[PDB]
Amino acid sequence: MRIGHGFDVHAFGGEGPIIIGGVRIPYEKGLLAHSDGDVALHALTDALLGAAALGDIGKLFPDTDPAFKGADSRELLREAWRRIQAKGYTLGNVDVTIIAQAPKMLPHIPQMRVFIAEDLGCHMDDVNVKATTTEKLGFTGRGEGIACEAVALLI
Amino acid sequence: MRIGHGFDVHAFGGEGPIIIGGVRIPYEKGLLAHSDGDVALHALTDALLGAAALGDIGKLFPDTDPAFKGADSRELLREAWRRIQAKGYTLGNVDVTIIAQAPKMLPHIPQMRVFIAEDLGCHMDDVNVKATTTEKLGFTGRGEGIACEAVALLI
Amino acid sequence: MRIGHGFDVHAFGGEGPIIIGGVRIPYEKGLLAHSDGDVALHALTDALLGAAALGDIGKLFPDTDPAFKGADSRELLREAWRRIQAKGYTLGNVDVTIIAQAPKMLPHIPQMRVFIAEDLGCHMDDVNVKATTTEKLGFTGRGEGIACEAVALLI
Ligand SMILES: [Zn+2]
Ligand SMILES: [Zn+2]
Ligand SMILES: [Zn+2]
């Protein structure tokens, strides 16, 4: 069994909605990024790559490479997962923590769990996503961006 | 074995002391929250709920529900744990990281470990709590609030 | 199997280079600290101590103790590891996440993995280090300091 950890942040910018955990969540502003800026999945991705000792998403899919511009993060999640399984690993379970003052993630978590579980080909019970606020404190507290953390256990 | 991760932040406000890890720590200002605002235990709670795939504390005990106003977080910790065990899980071990510029957590960690170990009905050796500063950097660095992180492994 | 988590931050100050993961990385400014201020290794250290239920680096090697002034963090990593093994633990694997806007950590990760793997006496495949930016957001985003997170699994 191997443990992995990921972390990611993206600044707000442009018009909404945002894409978090694969779900299109309506919001005033959107998120600035080379890909779709899905903070939730980038963190999950790194956590998986991390546990598999495959590095990180920024080594696998560079900002530099314009092929990744506008990239659907689920697409990136599946590839990393493809490569992870190839190295011989299987999913133990994953946990994700979105840190944002707004929008409300809560109602969207189930659909997120559906997308992720599909993408990893695991049962939803092996996928958990949760959310928290920094109580107005911080760049997140000030609504300047959204951060996310994730842990994974591969077998 | 399942892995979980939690994270929480609370802003300073009012008069002290604060309650971190169940311990009443003397401080100038206190912590703003719907419950007792015990950052340490909320993070631990989510980490456990997370590993058990039971969501998060904000789904289990809403800000909205006035029954939780002033709630003793150990009380919330025990319930989540009750439900977690009901799902068939047992404690592997937990690790908590308090991130605060002040007050000094260090002297209080043992008592915190005593409360948590009791609450989870595990041996203290399965419970670890530590502390760190952001070296004046950040909302925590500026003494605007206290954040905490936690990881848990259920069996 | 036990899980551990660590976290650390250090402010920029003085002239560079910085020392992250044991590697001397060239940078304009350096990092302020009592030891060499190697954020990466302090976080890794706490993660290991954490999983072993041995507390944290600030309890083991105090700021107060002037013997630790200028301390090479690898030296601290090895001791904590010494004590950790003495308690009967062996390395499962570790994952580290450096959070910095600059300098570029990426090219240095391999050497970091070499130092850490040596220090823990494990194969490099059991050691993973990755890096991320807060996209200009935060004290890290503003280039005020560098933070790092880490998870470890002991057996
Ligand atoms: Zn990202
Ligand atoms: Zn809280
Ligand atoms: Zn440090």
Side-chain angles (χ1 to χ4, degrees):
Chain A
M1 269 177 244
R2 290 184 61 118
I3 187 181
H5 170 269
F7 173 86
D8 194 26
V9 171
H10 283 286
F12 278 128
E15 291 303 282
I18 60 182
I19 309 285
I20 303 291
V23 188
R24 205 188 207 242
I25 301 173
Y27 193 47
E28 343 152 352
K29 22 192 169 75
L31 283 183
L32 304 181
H34 177 68
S35 71
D36 56 6
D38 190 327
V39 197
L41 302 184
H42 294 169
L44 175 57
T45 300
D46 279 355
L48 291 166
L49 285 183
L54 294 175
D56 71 35
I57 210 182
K59 166 214 145 188
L60 249 86
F61 322 116
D63 294 50
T64 76
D65 203 322
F68 307 128
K69 182 204 159 193
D72 167 342
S73 293
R74 284 185 69 184
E75 217 155 74
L76 303 190
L77 167 56
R78 298 190 229 100
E79 177 60 1
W81 185 233
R82 187 189 64 63
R83 309 193 186 183
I84 295 172
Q85 296 187 99
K87 194 176 181 257
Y89 301 95
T90 56
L91 197 72
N93 76 113
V94 308
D95 195 1
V96 180
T97 308
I98 303 167
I99 301 161
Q101 198 67 219
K104 290 180 169 193
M105 302 301 167
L106 200 63
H108 312 283
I109 275 91
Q111 186 53 230
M112 286 183 187
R113 298 181 68 209
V114 170
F115 287 154
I116 297 172
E118 285 184 2
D119 287 350
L120 300 178
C122 70
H123 186 227
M124 263 186 79
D125 199 81
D126 292 325
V127 188
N128 187 75
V129 176
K130 64 185 96 63
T132 186
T133 295
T134 38
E135 310 289 61
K136 292 281 189 176
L137 302 189
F139 72 82
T140 49
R142 289 190 300 275
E144 306 179 333
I146 285 181
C148 187
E149 289 217 47
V151 292
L153 180 162
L154 298 177
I155 291 175
Chain B
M1 269 177 244
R2 290 184 61 118
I3 187 181
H5 170 269
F7 173 86
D8 194 26
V9 171
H10 283 286
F12 278 128
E15 291 303 282
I18 60 182
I19 309 285
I20 303 291
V23 188
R24 205 188 207 242
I25 301 173
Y27 193 47
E28 343 152 352
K29 22 192 169 75
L31 283 183
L32 304 181
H34 177 68
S35 71
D36 56 6
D38 190 327
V39 197
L41 302 184
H42 294 169
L44 175 57
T45 300
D46 279 355
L48 291 166
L49 285 183
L54 294 175
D56 71 35
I57 210 182
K59 166 214 145 188
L60 249 86
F61 322 116
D63 294 50
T64 76
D65 203 322
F68 307 128
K69 182 204 159 193
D72 167 342
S73 293
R74 284 185 69 184
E75 217 155 74
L76 303 190
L77 167 56
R78 298 190 229 100
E79 177 60 1
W81 185 233
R82 187 189 64 63
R83 309 193 186 183
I84 295 172
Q85 296 187 99
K87 194 176 181 257
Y89 301 95
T90 56
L91 197 72
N93 76 113
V94 308
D95 195 1
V96 180
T97 308
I98 303 167
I99 301 161
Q101 198 67 219
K104 290 180 169 193
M105 302 301 167
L106 200 63
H108 312 283
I109 275 91
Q111 186 53 230
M112 286 183 187
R113 298 181 68 209
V114 170
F115 287 154
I116 297 172
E118 285 184 2
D119 287 350
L120 300 178
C122 70
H123 186 227
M124 263 186 79
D125 199 81
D126 292 325
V127 188
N128 187 75
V129 176
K130 64 185 96 63
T132 186
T133 295
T134 38
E135 310 289 61
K136 292 281 189 176
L137 302 189
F139 72 82
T140 49
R142 289 190 300 275
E144 306 179 333
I146 285 181
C148 187
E149 289 217 47
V151 292
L153 180 162
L154 298 177
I155 291 175
Chain C
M1 269 177 244
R2 290 184 61 118
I3 187 181
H5 170 269
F7 173 86
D8 194 26
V9 171
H10 283 286
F12 278 128
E15 291 303 282
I18 60 182
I19 309 285
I20 303 291
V23 188
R24 205 188 207 242
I25 301 173
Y27 193 47
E28 343 152 352
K29 22 192 169 75
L31 283 183
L32 304 181
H34 177 68
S35 71
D36 56 6
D38 190 327
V39 197
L41 302 184
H42 294 169
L44 175 57
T45 300
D46 279 355
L48 291 166
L49 285 183
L54 294 175
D56 71 35
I57 210 182
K59 166 214 145 188
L60 249 86
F61 322 116
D63 294 50
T64 76
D65 203 322
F68 307 128
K69 182 204 159 193
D72 167 342
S73 293
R74 284 185 69 184
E75 217 155 74
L76 303 190
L77 167 56
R78 298 190 229 100
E79 177 60 1
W81 185 233
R82 187 189 64 63
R83 309 193 186 183
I84 295 172
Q85 296 187 99
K87 194 176 181 257
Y89 301 95
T90 56
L91 197 72
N93 76 113
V94 308
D95 195 1
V96 180
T97 308
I98 303 167
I99 301 161
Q101 198 67 219
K104 290 180 169 193
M105 302 301 167
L106 200 63
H108 312 283
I109 275 91
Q111 186 53 230
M112 286 183 187
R113 298 181 68 209
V114 170
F115 287 154
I116 297 172
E118 285 184 2
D119 287 350
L120 300 178
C122 70
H123 186 227
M124 263 186 79
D125 199 81
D126 292 325
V127 188
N128 187 75
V129 176
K130 64 185 96 63
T132 186
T133 295
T134 38
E135 310 289 61
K136 292 281 189 176
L137 302 189
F139 72 82
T140 49
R142 289 190 300 275
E144 306 179 333
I146 285 181
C148 187
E149 289 217 47
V151 292
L153 180 162
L154 298 177
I155 291 175

PDB file of all heavy atoms in Angstrom, chain C residues 112-143:
ATOM      1  N   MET C 112      17.068  15.704  -5.035  1.00  0.00           N
ATOM      2  CA  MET C 112      16.389  15.706  -3.751  1.00  0.00           C
ATOM      3  C   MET C 112      16.022  14.272  -3.422  1.00  0.00           C
ATOM      4  O   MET C 112      16.241  13.818  -2.299  1.00  0.00           O
ATOM      5  CB  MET C 112      15.106  16.512  -3.817  1.00  0.00           C
ATOM      6  CG  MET C 112      15.280  17.994  -3.866  1.00  0.00           C
ATOM      7  SD  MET C 112      13.665  18.754  -3.865  1.00  0.00           S
ATOM      8  CE  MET C 112      14.081  20.377  -4.123  1.00  0.00           C
ATOM      9  N   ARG C 113      15.480  13.547  -4.403  1.00  0.00           N
ATOM     10  CA  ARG C 113      15.087  12.164  -4.177  1.00  0.00           C
ATOM     11  C   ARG C 113      16.277  11.302  -3.845  1.00  0.00           C
ATOM     12  O   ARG C 113      16.151  10.312  -3.131  1.00  0.00           O
ATOM     13  CB  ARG C 113      14.380  11.596  -5.382  1.00  0.00           C
ATOM     14  CG  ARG C 113      13.141  12.330  -5.684  1.00  0.00           C
ATOM     15  CD  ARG C 113      12.460  11.742  -6.861  1.00  0.00           C
ATOM     16  NE  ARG C 113      11.952  10.433  -6.538  1.00  0.00           N
ATOM     17  CZ  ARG C 113      11.817   9.465  -7.429  1.00  0.00           C
ATOM     18  NH1 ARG C 113      12.192   9.682  -8.687  1.00  0.00           N
ATOM     19  NH2 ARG C 113      11.341   8.280  -7.060  1.00  0.00           N
ATOM     20  N   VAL C 114      17.434  11.662  -4.381  1.00  0.00           N
ATOM     21  CA  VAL C 114      18.657  10.925  -4.116  1.00  0.00           C
ATOM     22  C   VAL C 114      19.072  11.124  -2.643  1.00  0.00           C
ATOM     23  O   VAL C 114      19.294  10.155  -1.915  1.00  0.00           O
ATOM     24  CB  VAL C 114      19.747  11.412  -5.042  1.00  0.00           C
ATOM     25  CG1 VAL C 114      21.048  10.847  -4.643  1.00  0.00           C
ATOM     26  CG2 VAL C 114      19.409  11.039  -6.455  1.00  0.00           C
ATOM     27  N   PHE C 115      19.122  12.378  -2.199  1.00  0.00           N
ATOM     28  CA  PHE C 115      19.474  12.710  -0.825  1.00  0.00           C
ATOM     29  C   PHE C 115      18.536  12.078   0.188  1.00  0.00           C
ATOM     30  O   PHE C 115      18.983  11.457   1.142  1.00  0.00           O
ATOM     31  CB  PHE C 115      19.425  14.209  -0.646  1.00  0.00           C
ATOM     32  CG  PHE C 115      20.548  14.927  -1.303  1.00  0.00           C
ATOM     33  CD1 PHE C 115      20.405  16.243  -1.702  1.00  0.00           C
ATOM     34  CD2 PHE C 115      21.782  14.331  -1.434  1.00  0.00           C
ATOM     35  CE1 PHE C 115      21.481  16.952  -2.208  1.00  0.00           C
ATOM     36  CE2 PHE C 115      22.866  15.039  -1.943  1.00  0.00           C
ATOM     37  CZ  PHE C 115      22.714  16.349  -2.326  1.00  0.00           C
ATOM     38  N   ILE C 116      17.234  12.263  -0.007  1.00  0.00           N
ATOM     39  CA  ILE C 116      16.229  11.714   0.898  1.00  0.00           C
ATOM     40  C   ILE C 116      16.267  10.194   0.955  1.00  0.00           C
ATOM     41  O   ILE C 116      16.201   9.613   2.031  1.00  0.00           O
ATOM     42  CB  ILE C 116      14.797  12.156   0.504  1.00  0.00           C
ATOM     43  CG1 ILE C 116      14.665  13.680   0.619  1.00  0.00           C
ATOM     44  CG2 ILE C 116      13.768  11.446   1.380  1.00  0.00           C
ATOM     45  CD1 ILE C 116      13.364  14.270   0.076  1.00  0.00           C
ATOM     46  N   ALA C 117      16.344   9.543  -0.201  1.00  0.00           N
ATOM     47  CA  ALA C 117      16.373   8.082  -0.251  1.00  0.00           C
ATOM     48  C   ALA C 117      17.593   7.588   0.500  1.00  0.00           C
ATOM     49  O   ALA C 117      17.528   6.597   1.207  1.00  0.00           O
ATOM     50  CB  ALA C 117      16.408   7.608  -1.674  1.00  0.00           C
ATOM     51  N   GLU C 118      18.709   8.287   0.344  1.00  0.00           N
ATOM     52  CA  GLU C 118      19.922   7.911   1.049  1.00  0.00           C
ATOM     53  C   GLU C 118      19.650   8.065   2.533  1.00  0.00           C
ATOM     54  O   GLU C 118      19.734   7.100   3.274  1.00  0.00           O
ATOM     55  CB  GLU C 118      21.110   8.801   0.653  1.00  0.00           C
ATOM     56  CG  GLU C 118      21.715   8.510  -0.732  1.00  0.00           C
ATOM     57  CD  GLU C 118      22.967   9.348  -1.044  1.00  0.00           C
ATOM     58  OE1 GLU C 118      23.408  10.155  -0.171  1.00  0.00           O
ATOM     59  OE2 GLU C 118      23.504   9.190  -2.173  1.00  0.00           O
ATOM     60  N   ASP C 119      19.265   9.267   2.948  1.00  0.00           N
ATOM     61  CA  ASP C 119      18.978   9.559   4.344  1.00  0.00           C
ATOM     62  C   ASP C 119      18.030   8.588   5.035  1.00  0.00           C
ATOM     63  O   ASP C 119      18.164   8.337   6.227  1.00  0.00           O
ATOM     64  CB  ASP C 119      18.407  10.957   4.467  1.00  0.00           C
ATOM     65  CG  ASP C 119      19.428  12.016   4.265  1.00  0.00           C
ATOM     66  OD1 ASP C 119      20.640  11.705   4.206  1.00  0.00           O
ATOM     67  OD2 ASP C 119      19.013  13.182   4.186  1.00  0.00           O
ATOM     68  N   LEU C 120      17.040   8.082   4.308  1.00  0.00           N
ATOM     69  CA  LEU C 120      16.078   7.148   4.892  1.00  0.00           C
ATOM     70  C   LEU C 120      16.479   5.699   4.626  1.00  0.00           C
ATOM     71  O   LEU C 120      15.848   4.761   5.136  1.00  0.00           O
ATOM     72  CB  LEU C 120      14.669   7.413   4.347  1.00  0.00           C
ATOM     73  CG  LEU C 120      14.042   8.790   4.577  1.00  0.00           C
ATOM     74  CD1 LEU C 120      12.687   8.808   3.914  1.00  0.00           C
ATOM     75  CD2 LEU C 120      13.921   9.099   6.053  1.00  0.00           C
ATOM     76  N   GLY C 121      17.520   5.532   3.812  1.00  0.00           N
ATOM     77  CA  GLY C 121      18.023   4.216   3.459  1.00  0.00           C
ATOM     78  C   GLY C 121      16.963   3.396   2.770  1.00  0.00           C
ATOM     79  O   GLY C 121      16.753   2.238   3.106  1.00  0.00           O
ATOM     80  N   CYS C 122      16.277   4.003   1.815  1.00  0.00           N
ATOM     81  CA  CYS C 122      15.216   3.325   1.096  1.00  0.00           C
ATOM     82  C   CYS C 122      15.502   3.462  -0.368  1.00  0.00           C
ATOM     83  O   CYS C 122      16.433   4.149  -0.767  1.00  0.00           O
ATOM     84  CB  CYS C 122      13.872   3.982   1.389  1.00  0.00           C
ATOM     85  SG  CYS C 122      13.696   5.612   0.669  1.00  0.00           S
ATOM     86  N   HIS C 123      14.713   2.806  -1.192  1.00  0.00           N
ATOM     87  CA  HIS C 123      14.968   2.946  -2.589  1.00  0.00           C
ATOM     88  C   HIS C 123      14.301   4.233  -3.022  1.00  0.00           C
ATOM     89  O   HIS C 123      13.318   4.664  -2.429  1.00  0.00           O
ATOM     90  CB  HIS C 123      14.414   1.763  -3.368  1.00  0.00           C
ATOM     91  CG  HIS C 123      14.787   1.794  -4.814  1.00  0.00           C
ATOM     92  ND1 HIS C 123      13.877   1.587  -5.830  1.00  0.00           N
ATOM     93  CD2 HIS C 123      15.970   2.074  -5.417  1.00  0.00           C
ATOM     94  CE1 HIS C 123      14.480   1.742  -6.996  1.00  0.00           C
ATOM     95  NE2 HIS C 123      15.750   2.038  -6.774  1.00  0.00           N
ATOM     96  N   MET C 124      14.852   4.865  -4.045  1.00  0.00           N
ATOM     97  CA  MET C 124      14.272   6.091  -4.550  1.00  0.00           C
ATOM     98  C   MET C 124      12.810   5.902  -4.888  1.00  0.00           C
ATOM     99  O   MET C 124      12.027   6.835  -4.760  1.00  0.00           O
ATOM    100  CB  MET C 124      14.996   6.563  -5.800  1.00  0.00           C
ATOM    101  CG  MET C 124      16.042   7.606  -5.549  1.00  0.00           C
ATOM    102  SD  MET C 124      16.682   8.186  -7.103  1.00  0.00           S
ATOM    103  CE  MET C 124      15.399   9.313  -7.599  1.00  0.00           C
ATOM    104  N   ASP C 125      12.433   4.703  -5.321  1.00  0.00           N
ATOM    105  CA  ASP C 125      11.048   4.477  -5.680  1.00  0.00           C
ATOM    106  C   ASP C 125      10.103   4.640  -4.496  1.00  0.00           C
ATOM    107  O   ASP C 125       8.886   4.734  -4.656  1.00  0.00           O
ATOM    108  CB  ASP C 125      10.844   3.124  -6.357  1.00  0.00           C
ATOM    109  CG  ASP C 125       9.522   3.069  -7.132  1.00  0.00           C
ATOM    110  OD1 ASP C 125       9.491   3.585  -8.274  1.00  0.00           O
ATOM    111  OD2 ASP C 125       8.490   2.575  -6.601  1.00  0.00           O
ATOM    112  N   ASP C 126      10.651   4.703  -3.298  1.00  0.00           N
ATOM    113  CA  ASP C 126       9.796   4.874  -2.151  1.00  0.00           C
ATOM    114  C   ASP C 126       9.738   6.324  -1.766  1.00  0.00           C
ATOM    115  O   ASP C 126       9.099   6.674  -0.778  1.00  0.00           O
ATOM    116  CB  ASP C 126      10.294   4.050  -0.977  1.00  0.00           C
ATOM    117  CG  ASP C 126      10.164   2.571  -1.216  1.00  0.00           C
ATOM    118  OD1 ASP C 126       9.182   2.154  -1.879  1.00  0.00           O
ATOM    119  OD2 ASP C 126      11.065   1.832  -0.764  1.00  0.00           O
ATOM    120  N   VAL C 127      10.401   7.169  -2.548  1.00  0.00           N
ATOM    121  CA  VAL C 127      10.433   8.602  -2.288  1.00  0.00           C
ATOM    122  C   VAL C 127       9.932   9.427  -3.470  1.00  0.00           C
ATOM    123  O   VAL C 127      10.446   9.309  -4.584  1.00  0.00           O
ATOM    124  CB  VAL C 127      11.845   9.062  -1.966  1.00  0.00           C
ATOM    125  CG1 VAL C 127      11.829  10.490  -1.517  1.00  0.00           C
ATOM    126  CG2 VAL C 127      12.430   8.199  -0.884  1.00  0.00           C
ATOM    127  N   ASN C 128       8.923  10.256  -3.232  1.00  0.00           N
ATOM    128  CA  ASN C 128       8.393  11.112  -4.283  1.00  0.00           C
ATOM    129  C   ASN C 128       8.346  12.564  -3.799  1.00  0.00           C
ATOM    130  O   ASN C 128       8.031  12.831  -2.641  1.00  0.00           O
ATOM    131  CB  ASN C 128       7.008  10.642  -4.706  1.00  0.00           C
ATOM    132  CG  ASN C 128       6.482  11.398  -5.912  1.00  0.00           C
ATOM    133  OD1 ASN C 128       6.910  11.173  -7.045  1.00  0.00           O
ATOM    134  ND2 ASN C 128       5.534  12.285  -5.676  1.00  0.00           N
ATOM    135  N   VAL C 129       8.726  13.492  -4.665  1.00  0.00           N
ATOM    136  CA  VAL C 129       8.730  14.910  -4.332  1.00  0.00           C
ATOM    137  C   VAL C 129       8.084  15.593  -5.518  1.00  0.00           C
ATOM    138  O   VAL C 129       8.332  15.201  -6.662  1.00  0.00           O
ATOM    139  CB  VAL C 129      10.149  15.446  -4.237  1.00  0.00           C
ATOM    140  CG1 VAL C 129      10.126  16.921  -4.003  1.00  0.00           C
ATOM    141  CG2 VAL C 129      10.894  14.752  -3.148  1.00  0.00           C
ATOM    142  N   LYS C 130       7.215  16.558  -5.274  1.00  0.00           N
ATOM    143  CA  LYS C 130       6.601  17.251  -6.389  1.00  0.00           C
ATOM    144  C   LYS C 130       6.520  18.703  -6.035  1.00  0.00           C
ATOM    145  O   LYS C 130       6.878  19.072  -4.908  1.00  0.00           O
ATOM    146  CB  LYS C 130       5.237  16.676  -6.745  1.00  0.00           C
ATOM    147  CG  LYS C 130       4.176  16.796  -5.696  1.00  0.00           C
ATOM    148  CD  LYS C 130       2.925  16.079  -6.166  1.00  0.00           C
ATOM    149  CE  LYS C 130       2.872  14.679  -5.624  1.00  0.00           C
ATOM    150  NZ  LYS C 130       2.797  14.725  -4.141  1.00  0.00           N
ATOM    151  N   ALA C 131       6.103  19.535  -6.985  1.00  0.00           N
ATOM    152  CA  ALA C 131       6.029  20.967  -6.730  1.00  0.00           C
ATOM    153  C   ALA C 131       4.821  21.618  -7.354  1.00  0.00           C
ATOM    154  O   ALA C 131       4.301  21.144  -8.373  1.00  0.00           O
ATOM    155  CB  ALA C 131       7.284  21.646  -7.200  1.00  0.00           C
ATOM    156  N   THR C 132       4.389  22.714  -6.735  1.00  0.00           N
ATOM    157  CA  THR C 132       3.236  23.467  -7.191  1.00  0.00           C
ATOM    158  C   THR C 132       3.322  24.949  -6.828  1.00  0.00           C
ATOM    159  O   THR C 132       3.988  25.332  -5.862  1.00  0.00           O
ATOM    160  CB  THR C 132       1.942  22.889  -6.596  1.00  0.00           C
ATOM    161  OG1 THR C 132       0.819  23.559  -7.176  1.00  0.00           O
ATOM    162  CG2 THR C 132       1.903  23.077  -5.077  1.00  0.00           C
ATOM    163  N   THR C 133       2.575  25.761  -7.573  1.00  0.00           N
ATOM    164  CA  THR C 133       2.500  27.216  -7.394  1.00  0.00           C
ATOM    165  C   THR C 133       1.122  27.574  -6.863  1.00  0.00           C
ATOM    166  O   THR C 133       0.171  26.816  -7.050  1.00  0.00           O
ATOM    167  CB  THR C 133       2.594  27.904  -8.753  1.00  0.00           C
ATOM    168  OG1 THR C 133       3.873  27.656  -9.327  1.00  0.00           O
ATOM    169  CG2 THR C 133       2.410  29.356  -8.631  1.00  0.00           C
ATOM    170  N   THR C 134       1.002  28.712  -6.197  1.00  0.00           N
ATOM    171  CA  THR C 134      -0.307  29.141  -5.732  1.00  0.00           C
ATOM    172  C   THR C 134      -0.849  30.209  -6.706  1.00  0.00           C
ATOM    173  O   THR C 134      -1.737  30.999  -6.370  1.00  0.00           O
ATOM    174  CB  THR C 134      -0.223  29.671  -4.315  1.00  0.00           C
ATOM    175  OG1 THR C 134       0.995  30.411  -4.151  1.00  0.00           O
ATOM    176  CG2 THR C 134      -0.228  28.524  -3.363  1.00  0.00           C
ATOM    177  N   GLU C 135      -0.338  30.165  -7.938  1.00  0.00           N
ATOM    178  CA  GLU C 135      -0.678  31.077  -9.031  1.00  0.00           C
ATOM    179  C   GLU C 135      -0.712  32.548  -8.613  1.00  0.00           C
ATOM    180  O   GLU C 135      -1.683  33.264  -8.873  1.00  0.00           O
ATOM    181  CB  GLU C 135      -1.993  30.665  -9.702  1.00  0.00           C
ATOM    182  CG  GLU C 135      -2.098  29.188 -10.117  1.00  0.00           C
ATOM    183  CD  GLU C 135      -1.230  28.798 -11.306  1.00  0.00           C
ATOM    184  OE1 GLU C 135       0.013  28.926 -11.216  1.00  0.00           O
ATOM    185  OE2 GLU C 135      -1.790  28.338 -12.326  1.00  0.00           O
ATOM    186  N   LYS C 136       0.381  32.999  -8.005  1.00  0.00           N
ATOM    187  CA  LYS C 136       0.513  34.370  -7.524  1.00  0.00           C
ATOM    188  C   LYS C 136      -0.327  34.666  -6.283  1.00  0.00           C
ATOM    189  O   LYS C 136      -0.115  35.682  -5.629  1.00  0.00           O
ATOM    190  CB  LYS C 136       0.199  35.375  -8.625  1.00  0.00           C
ATOM    191  CG  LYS C 136       1.209  35.426  -9.770  1.00  0.00           C
ATOM    192  CD  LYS C 136       2.449  36.226  -9.411  1.00  0.00           C
ATOM    193  CE  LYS C 136       3.325  36.441 -10.652  1.00  0.00           C
ATOM    194  NZ  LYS C 136       4.537  37.306 -10.402  1.00  0.00           N
ATOM    195  N   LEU C 137      -1.260  33.783  -5.943  1.00  0.00           N
ATOM    196  CA  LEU C 137      -2.077  33.972  -4.750  1.00  0.00           C
ATOM    197  C   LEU C 137      -1.298  33.619  -3.481  1.00  0.00           C
ATOM    198  O   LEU C 137      -0.501  32.663  -3.460  1.00  0.00           O
ATOM    199  CB  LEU C 137      -3.330  33.088  -4.798  1.00  0.00           C
ATOM    200  CG  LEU C 137      -4.258  33.272  -5.978  1.00  0.00           C
ATOM    201  CD1 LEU C 137      -5.507  32.498  -5.759  1.00  0.00           C
ATOM    202  CD2 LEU C 137      -4.595  34.709  -6.089  1.00  0.00           C
ATOM    203  N   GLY C 138      -1.525  34.401  -2.431  1.00  0.00           N
ATOM    204  CA  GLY C 138      -0.896  34.127  -1.149  1.00  0.00           C
ATOM    205  C   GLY C 138       0.511  34.594  -0.850  1.00  0.00           C
ATOM    206  O   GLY C 138       1.172  35.174  -1.697  1.00  0.00           O
ATOM    207  N   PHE C 139       0.975  34.340   0.369  1.00  0.00           N
ATOM    208  CA  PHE C 139       2.301  34.764   0.739  1.00  0.00           C
ATOM    209  C   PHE C 139       3.272  34.056  -0.139  1.00  0.00           C
ATOM    210  O   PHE C 139       4.314  34.588  -0.461  1.00  0.00           O
ATOM    211  CB  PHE C 139       2.600  34.519   2.213  1.00  0.00           C
ATOM    212  CG  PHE C 139       2.805  33.076   2.588  1.00  0.00           C
ATOM    213  CD1 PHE C 139       4.032  32.459   2.390  1.00  0.00           C
ATOM    214  CD2 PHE C 139       1.802  32.369   3.256  1.00  0.00           C
ATOM    215  CE1 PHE C 139       4.264  31.167   2.860  1.00  0.00           C
ATOM    216  CE2 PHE C 139       2.021  31.070   3.730  1.00  0.00           C
ATOM    217  CZ  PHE C 139       3.255  30.469   3.535  1.00  0.00           C
ATOM    218  N   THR C 140       2.930  32.842  -0.531  1.00  0.00           N
ATOM    219  CA  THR C 140       3.799  32.096  -1.419  1.00  0.00           C
ATOM    220  C   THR C 140       3.642  32.741  -2.785  1.00  0.00           C
ATOM    221  O   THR C 140       4.636  32.987  -3.470  1.00  0.00           O
ATOM    222  CB  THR C 140       3.397  30.617  -1.539  1.00  0.00           C
ATOM    223  OG1 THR C 140       1.989  30.529  -1.804  1.00  0.00           O
ATOM    224  CG2 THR C 140       3.753  29.859  -0.288  1.00  0.00           C
ATOM    225  N   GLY C 141       2.397  33.014  -3.172  1.00  0.00           N
ATOM    226  CA  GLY C 141       2.136  33.626  -4.460  1.00  0.00           C
ATOM    227  C   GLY C 141       2.847  34.950  -4.605  1.00  0.00           C
ATOM    228  O   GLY C 141       3.340  35.301  -5.673  1.00  0.00           O
ATOM    229  N   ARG C 142       2.966  35.664  -3.499  1.00  0.00           N
ATOM    230  CA  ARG C 142       3.624  36.948  -3.505  1.00  0.00           C
ATOM    231  C   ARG C 142       5.117  36.798  -3.326  1.00  0.00           C
ATOM    232  O   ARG C 142       5.830  37.781  -3.162  1.00  0.00           O
ATOM    233  CB  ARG C 142       3.081  37.810  -2.393  1.00  0.00           C
ATOM    234  CG  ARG C 142       1.691  38.263  -2.640  1.00  0.00           C
ATOM    235  CD  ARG C 142       1.341  39.301  -1.607  1.00  0.00           C
ATOM    236  NE  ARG C 142       1.439  38.712  -0.288  1.00  0.00           N
ATOM    237  CZ  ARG C 142       0.459  38.027   0.274  1.00  0.00           C
ATOM    238  NH1 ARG C 142      -0.699  37.909  -0.365  1.00  0.00           N
ATOM    239  NH2 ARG C 142       0.634  37.490   1.473  1.00  0.00           N
ATOM    240  N   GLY C 143       5.596  35.569  -3.320  1.00  0.00           N
ATOM    241  CA  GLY C 143       7.013  35.351  -3.155  1.00  0.00           C
ATOM    242  C   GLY C 143       7.548  35.764  -1.798  1.00  0.00           C
ATOM    243  O   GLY C 143       8.724  36.138  -1.690  1.00  0.00           O
TER     244      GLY C 143
END
